[PDB]
C-alpha cells in the first residue's frame, strides 16, 4: 500500500556480477541496519568467477558497495595418506547471504570437493560450503558439513547410500532466533535433499583454517530414505523457520521439495530432529510448488500461517487450453494441536510466463494497521514482461485476494527484478518496514521504503 | 563432556586371547573415527590401527595385522579391541583415541587398560 | 613409516622457565603433528593439534610451531603440573607414529 514507488534508492555491482542474487538486512552490534548482498559471478583473482558478497550500508543515494572478503584461494591438504582439495571455481559464493545478530552467513553451494588417496578418488563434486564473517571484528569461520573422505568404490559397494558428495550445502539457508544455521543441500543423499544444522557459536568455535575436515560435534543432519516419493526431490531447495506444534520451546523446520513424488512438489514442516510434523503436496506436477516458502502470522492470532510458492503452475482458461503464470498457497495455522487444511486462500499470476510465487517475502505490517503483510514477485510479469512485485495485506481471514499497490520492475529486459526479496526491516528509522528487490540480471538491488499512509 | 571409559585390567596366560573395550561417554561412538595405541615403558607408544564405527571400516599398523582386530558396536556406543595368540611382548596399556575437530587428530584418550600376559 | 626423532629425552628445569621440546620428521608432514601430555601415572591429555592450534581447555602458556620436518612445543613459565611426559605424533601417513617422550624433571 504505502511503499514509495518514487523516490528509490539504487546499489549496483559489477558487470556480469550477478549483484542481487540474493540479499538481506543486516543490523551491527550498535543496531545500524546495511544491506548484505551477495553477487555469485563475480570474478576471483584467477579472472575466474568465484562469485562474492557485498556490505552496503545505508544512504538514501545508494551506489557503490565495499566487498566483504573471503578467502578464494583453492585449498590442498595432504593427511592420513590423503589429499584433501577444495575447488572455488564457478563455486557461487553469494547465491545465498542470511543475516543473523552480527554474524553474516554466505554460502557457495557449487563449491567442488575431492580426495585424492593413490589411484583411486572419492570424486570431485560440488559439496558446497557456507562462510561466516563477523564484520565488525573480522572473524571468519567455515562450515561444509557434507565434504567427506571416503573413495568413490566404497559407495558403489555400498549402494550409494547416505552420499551427500553433490549436497550443495547453502543452495538456501536460514538461521533460528537463537543462532541456529540450517542449511539446505537438495543435491543431498543421491539427489533426495538433505538439511544440516549447527549453531553458529560452535561452527566459529570449532573452525580452524586449512584443516578442511573437521567435526562440528553440535551438528545434526537428516536422513536418507528408500522411499522412492523422495526420490529427485531436491528437499531443500527452499527453507524457513517457524513455531507450528504449540510448544515455544522447539524451533520447527519448513522445507521445500518442489521436485517431490515424480515432480507434484510438496513442503514439509518438521521438528528440529527432522521428524515429519506435517506434508503439503504439490497441486499440479511441474509447477514447482515449494520454490520458495514464507513464515509469518498474516490474521494477527499470533500463529505463524505458511506461504508456499509454485511459480511455473498453469492455470485453467477458455477452450481447454492451460496458461503458465504462477501460483501461491495460504495455510493459516489452525488453533491448538490440528494439522494445516486446505489452503485459505489461492493467488493466481495473471502474466503468461511471468513467474507469479517465485519469491514471497513477509513484510511486517507495512500500513501499521495490525496485521502482517507479504509481497509476492513475478520476475518476468508486468505487461511488458520486466517484472512486478505485488503486495498483499493481512486481515482477520487471511489475506486480501487483490493486490494493494504494484511495483513495476526500474530495470530494463532480462533484469529478474523480484528473483530475490527482503522485507520486515526498518532501514531508515523512520517507524515503517521497508523492502529490499534484487535485480540480478541487471546487478543491481532496489531499496523501496515505507512512507506514512495517504 | 567427552568421555572415553575403557575397560578394567586383564591378566590372561599365553595363546589366548582378550577382548578389551572403549565406551563413549557424553557423545555418540559413531562421530569420529576410534584409534588405538600400545604403551609400553621400553617400547614407548605404538599406534594399533583404528576404526571408523558409523561403516565398520578399519586401518593397521602391518605390524599389529593379525593380533589386532577392532570393532564397535554403534548400539552399545562402544568401540573394541582384540587381541590373538598373546605373547609376553603384549603385555602393554592399551588406549583408545579420539580427535576434537581436526578429523586425523589424536586429541582424546581414554584411561587406558593394562594387559599382563603371564603362565 | 615416518620416524619421529623427539629431543632431549629429559630435561632438568625449574618453576618458570621457558623451555622448548622438539620433533624432527623423516620427511615433511606440513604441521599434521599432534602434542600430547601424561602427567605421572596418569592417561593422556592432548595439547597441540595442526601444528598450532590449542586443544580445548589448555592454557595458553602452551604453544606449537615449526613446519616442513620440524617442529616444536613450549611452555612458557612452568608450572607444577606441567612436570610430566610430553610425545609428539605425525598423521600425515598412515600408520600414525610417535616419538620417543620428553620427561620434563625438577632441578635442584
Known amino acids: 500500500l504505502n511503499l514509495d514507488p518514487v523516490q528509490l534508492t539504487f546499489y549496483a555491482g559489477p558487470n556480469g556480477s550477478q549483484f542481487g542474487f540474493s540479499l538481506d538486512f543486516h543490523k551491527d552490534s550498535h543496531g545500524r541496519v546495511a544491506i548484505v548482498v551477495g553477487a555469485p559471478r563475480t570474478l576471483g583473482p584467477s579472472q575466474e568467477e568465484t562469485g562474492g558478497v557485498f556490505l552496503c550500508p545505508w544512504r538514501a543515494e545508494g551506489g557503490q558497495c565495499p566487498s566483504l572478503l573471503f578467502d578464494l584461494r583453492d585449498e590442498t591438504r595432504n593427511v592420513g595418506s590423503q589429499t584433501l582439495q577444495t575447488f572455488k571455481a564457478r563455486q557461487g559464493l553469494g547465491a545465498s547471504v542470511v543475516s543473523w545478530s552480527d554474524v553474516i552467513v554466505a554460502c557457495a553451494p557449487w563449491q567442488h570437493w575431492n580426495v585424492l588417496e593413490k589411484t583411486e578418488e572419492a570424486e570431485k563434486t560440488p559439496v558446497g560450503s557456507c562462510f561466516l564473517a563477523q564484520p565488525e571484528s573480522g572473524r571468519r569461520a567455515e562450515y561444509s558439513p557434507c565434504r567427506g573422505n571416503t573413495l568413490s568404490r566404497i559407495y558403489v559397494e555400498n549402494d550409494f547410500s547416505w552420499d551427500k558428495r553433490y549436497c550443495e550445502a547453502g543452495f538456501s539457508s536460514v538461521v533460528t532466533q537463537a543462532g541456529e544455521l540450517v542449511l539446505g543441500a537438495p543435491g543431498g543423499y543421491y539427489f533426495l535433499g538433505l538439511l544440516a544444522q549447527a549453531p553458529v557459536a560452535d561452527i566459529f568455535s570449532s573452525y580452524r583454517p586449512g584443516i578442511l575436515l573437521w567435526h562440528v560435534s553440535s551438528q545434526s543432519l537428516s536422513f536418507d530414505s528408500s522411499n522412492p516419493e523422495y526420490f529427485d526431490g531436491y528437499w531443500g531447495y527452499s527453507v524457513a523457520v517457524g513455531e507450528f506444534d504449540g510448544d515455544l520451546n522447539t524451533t520447527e523446520y519448513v522445507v521445500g521439495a518442489p521436485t517431490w513424488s515424480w515432480t507434484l512438489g510438496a513442503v514439509e514442516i518438521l521438528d528440529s530432529y527432522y521428524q515429519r510434523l506435517h506434508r503439503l503436496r504439490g497441486e499440479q506436477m511441474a509447477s514447482y510448488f515449494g520454490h520458495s516458502v514464507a513464515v509469518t502470522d498474516v490474521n494477527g492470532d499470533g500463529r505463524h500461517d505458511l506461504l508456499v510458492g509454485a511459480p511455473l503452475y498453469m492455470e485453467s482458461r477458455a477452450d481447454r487450453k492451460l496458461a503458465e503464470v504462477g501460483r501461491v498457497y495460504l495455510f493459516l495455522q489452525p488453533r491448538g494441536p490440528h494439522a494445516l487444511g486446505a489452503p485459505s486462500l489461492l493467488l493466481t499470476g495473471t502474466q503468461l510466463y511471468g513467474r507469479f510465487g517465485s519469491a514471497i517475502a513477509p513484510l511486517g505490517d507495512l500500513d501499521r494497521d495490525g496485521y502482517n503483510d507479504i509481497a509476492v514477485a513475478a520476475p518476468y510479469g508486468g505487461p511488458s514482461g520486466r517484472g512486478q512485485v505485488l503486495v498483499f495485506l493481512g486481515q482477520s481471514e487471511g489475506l486480501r485476494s487483490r493486490p494493494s499497490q504494484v511495483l513495476d520492475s526500474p530495470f530494463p529486459t532480462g533484469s529478474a527484478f523480484g528473483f530475490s526479496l527482503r522485507g520486515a526491516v526498518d532501514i531508515d528509522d523512520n517507524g515503517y518496514p521497508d523492502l529490499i528487490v534484487g535485480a540480478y540480471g541487471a546487478n543491481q538491488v532496489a531499496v523501496y521504503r515505507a512512507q506514512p499512509v495517504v | 563432556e567427552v568421555q572415553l571409559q575403557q575397560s578394567g585390567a586383564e591378566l590372561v596366560k599365553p595363546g589366548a586371547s582378550v577382548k578389551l573395550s572403549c565406551t563413549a561417554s557424553?557423545?555418540?561412538?559413531?562421530?569420529?573415527?576410534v584409534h588405538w595405541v600400545k604403551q609400553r615403558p621400553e617400547q614407548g607408544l605404538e599406534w594399533i590401527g583404528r576404526?571408523?564405527?558409523?561403516?565398520?571400516?578399519?586401518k593397521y599398523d602391518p605390524k599389529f595385522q593379525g593380533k589386532a582386530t577392532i570393532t564397535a558396536d554403534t548400539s552399545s556406543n562402544t568401540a573394541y579391541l582384540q587381541l590373538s595368540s598373546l605373547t609376553s611382548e603384549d603385555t602393554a596399556v592399551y588406549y583408545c583415541?579420539?580427535?576434537?575437530?581436526?578429523?586425523?587428530?589424536?586429541?582424546?584418550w581414554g584411561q587406558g587398560t593394562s594387559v599382563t600376559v603371564s603362565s | 613409516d615416518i620416524l619421529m626423532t623427539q629431543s632431549p629425552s629429559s630435561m632438568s628445569v625449574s618453576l618458570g622457565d621457558t623451555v622448548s621440546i622438539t620433533c624432527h620428521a623423516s620427511?615433511?608432514?606440513?604441521?599434521?603433528i599432534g602434542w600430547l601430555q601424561q602427567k605421572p601415572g596418569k592417561s593422556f591429555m592432548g595439547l597441540i593439534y595442526?601444528?598450532?592450534n590449542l586443544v580445548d581447555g589448555v592454557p595458553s602458556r602452551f604453544s606449537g610451531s615449526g613446519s616442513g620436518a620440524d617442529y616444536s612445543l613450549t611452555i612458557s613459565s612452568l608450572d607444577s603440573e606441567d612436570f610430566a611426559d610430553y610425545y609428539c605424533?605425525?598423521?600425515?601417513?598412515?600408520?600414525?607414529?610417535f616419538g620417543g617422550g620428553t620427561k620434563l624433571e625438577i632441578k635442584r
Open positions: 620427511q615433511g608432514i606440513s604441521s599434521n
Open positions: 576404526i571408523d564405527p558409523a561403516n565398520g571400516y578399519t
Open positions: 595442526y601444528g598450532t
Open positions: 583415541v579420539r580427535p576434537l575437530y581436526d578429523y586425523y587428530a589424536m586429541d582424546y
Open positions: 605424533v605425525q598423521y600425515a601417513q598412515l600408520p600414525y607414529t
Open positions: 557424553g557423545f555418540n561412538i559413531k562421530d569420529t573415527y
